[PDB]
Design a protein around this ligand. Sequence first.
Ligand SMILES: Nc1nc2c(ncn2[C@@H]2O[C@H](COP(=O)(O)OP(=O)(O)O)[C@@H](O)[C@H]2O)c(=O)[nH]1
Ligand SMILES: [Ca+2]
Ligand SMILES: [Cl-]
Ligand SMILES: [Cl-]
Ligand SMILES: [Cl-]
Ligand code: NA
Length: 169
Amino acid sequence: SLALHKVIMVGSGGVGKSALTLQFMYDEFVEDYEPTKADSYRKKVVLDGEEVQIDILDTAGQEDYAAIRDNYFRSGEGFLCVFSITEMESFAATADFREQILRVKEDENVPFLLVGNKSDLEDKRQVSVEEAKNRAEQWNVNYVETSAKTRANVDKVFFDLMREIRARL
Ligand SMILES: Nc1nc2c(ncn2[C@@H]2O[C@H](COP(=O)(O)OP(=O)(O)O)[C@@H](O)[C@H]2O)c(=O)[nH]1
Ligand SMILES: [Ca+2]
Ligand SMILES: [Cl-]
Ligand SMILES: [Cl-]
Ligand SMILES: [Cl-]
Ligand code: NA
């Protein structure tokens, strides 16, 4: 009887998909989570006063068979597209995840946030706020910077994505 919001974490390696997920789920910064391990998490949460369930698929890039990975995308209702602000190549990689999602969901308004993680490493920044905001503007998505280490904006990205799912679906 509860809304079930199906969230999928995407992004290239080491950007913080798992750390964000585990901070959200378990209030812990986890620094050694197996890079090849994908997992699903489910939690009851109160979204704007409504009890809902969030399901998070923390993807780990291991499924290379395109039909299978497209099936995983098709199941998702919203996407956190994560890059690390400290790795420009991970920002460049977001374009591919966007295209993969769009090919399957066929809706440019699919619930989607662009997430610049590792905001606590400003001294290592390789991706400017300006360029990330410009990309988000091009895609008509919001850009949020997070830190799985300090928990900055972690609840925000999950809740705001659920708000998009709620509004759009
Ligand atoms: N300083 C800092 N390190 C982070 C952050 N998020 C992840 N890390 C570190 O980056 C590494 C990779 O994170 P992980 O979540 O496993 O990356 P994934 O491959 O995208 O799942 C780990 O050592 C984390 O501790 C963050 O926000 N800040
Ligand atoms: Ca991971
Ligand atoms: Cl796995
Ligand atoms: Cl799983
Ligand atoms: Cl609570
Ligand atoms: Na612009």
